[PDB]
Ligand binder design. Sequence first.
Ligand SMILES: C[n+]1cn([C@@H]2O[C@H](COP(=O)(O)OP(=O)(O)OP(=O)(O)OC[C@H]3O[C@@H](n4cnc5c(N)ncnc54)[C@H](O)[C@@H]3O)[C@@H](O)[C@H]2O)c2nc(N)[nH]c(=O)c21
Ligand SMILES: Nc1ncnc2c1ncn2[C@@H]1O[C@H](CSCC[C@H](N)C(=O)O)[C@@H](O)[C@H]1O
Length: 260
Amino acid sequence: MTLGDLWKRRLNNCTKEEFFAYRRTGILETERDKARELLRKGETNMGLAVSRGTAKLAWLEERGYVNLKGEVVDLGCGRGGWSYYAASRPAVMGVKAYTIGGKGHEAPKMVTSLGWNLIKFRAGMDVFTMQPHRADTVMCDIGESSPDAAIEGERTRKVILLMEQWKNRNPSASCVFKVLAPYRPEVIEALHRFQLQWGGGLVRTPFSRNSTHEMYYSTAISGNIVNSVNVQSRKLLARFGDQRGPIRVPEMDLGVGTRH
Ligand SMILES: C[n+]1cn([C@@H]2O[C@H](COP(=O)(O)OP(=O)(O)OP(=O)(O)OC[C@H]3O[C@@H](n4cnc5c(N)ncnc54)[C@H](O)[C@@H]3O)[C@@H](O)[C@H]2O)c2nc(N)[nH]c(=O)c21
Ligand SMILES: Nc1ncnc2c1ncn2[C@@H]1O[C@H](CSCC[C@H](N)C(=O)O)[C@@H](O)[C@H]1O
C-alpha cells in the first residue's frame, strides 16, 4: 500500500464537514461568477473559459511544461476548456476534439472563443477504441474520480495505454495527459514504461482540489516519477486539518474571434 492509497482512505474517512473544509483549502480557484451564467444563458460570444480545465492547461503552458503546437488532438474534450485554450495559441494550427457525451458526460460548449473556427468537435466518440491519426500534440484530460481507488487506477491505466497507442502512431508528438491516480502501483508501472520510451514527467497544478490526486504528465518535463508522486501524497496528507480557504483568481478570458 502506498502513501497515496492512505490519503484516499483518509479522504473517504472524513465527515461531511471535514470533507468540505479539506477539498479547497490552499488551492487556486478561478472566479466563474460571470462565466458560469453566460454559459447557461446560452451566450456564445464569450472568451471566458468554458470550464475550470482551461486555467490548468494555461498554467502548464505558461510554466513551460507543455508544448502545444501544430495539429492538436484533445482526447476526452468534455466541455472543451482545453480545446479552446489550444485553439487560441498561435503555434496551434488546428484542434480535433473528441468526447463521448451522453448521460453523465459533458458535451462541448459552443462559443466564439479565439480560434474556435480551428476546432472540429466530435461528440459521441469513444477515444479508447478510436484509431489514432496524425497529430503533433496529443492531449487527454480523461480520469473520472471514484471513491474506489482501484477503479481510479484502472481508469488511469486506460489513459496511459491510450497515450502509448497515439505515440505508436506519432512517435514525435508532444503529449500532455491527466494521471488521475498516480499513486497506484499499476499506474506507476505503466508510467515508468511510458517515460523510459518517450521521456517526460509528472507535475501537480495548483488548481486541482485536494480531493483528487490528479497529476499531469507531459513529455516536455522530466523527473523521477515515484518521487513526484510521494512528494504530492505527503503534501495532500499534510493539508488534512488545514483551515485556510481557496485563493480566488480571475478566470481565463481568451477573447473572441476567428484565426486564419
Ligand atoms: C462527495 N465526496 C467525495 N469524496 C471523495 O472525494 C473524491 C473525489 O472528490 P469529489 O468526488 O468531491 O469530486 P467530483 O468532481 O466528483 O464532485 P462531487 O462533489 O459531486 O463528488 C461525487 C462523488 O463522491 C462520491 N461520494 C459521495 N459521497 C461520498 C462519501 N461519503 N464518501 C466517499 N465518496 C463519496 C460519489 O459516489 C461520487 O462518486 C471521491 O472519489 C471521494 O473519495 C468524499 N469523501 C467524503 N468523506 N465525504 C464526501 O462527502 C465525499
Ligand atoms: N471513453 C471516452 N471517450 C471520450 N471521452 C471520454 C471518454 N471517457 C470519458 N470521456 C470524457 O472525457 C472528459 C474529460 S473532462 C476534461 C476537462 C476538459 N479538458 C476541459 O478543459 O473542459 C469528460 O467530459 C468525459 O465525459
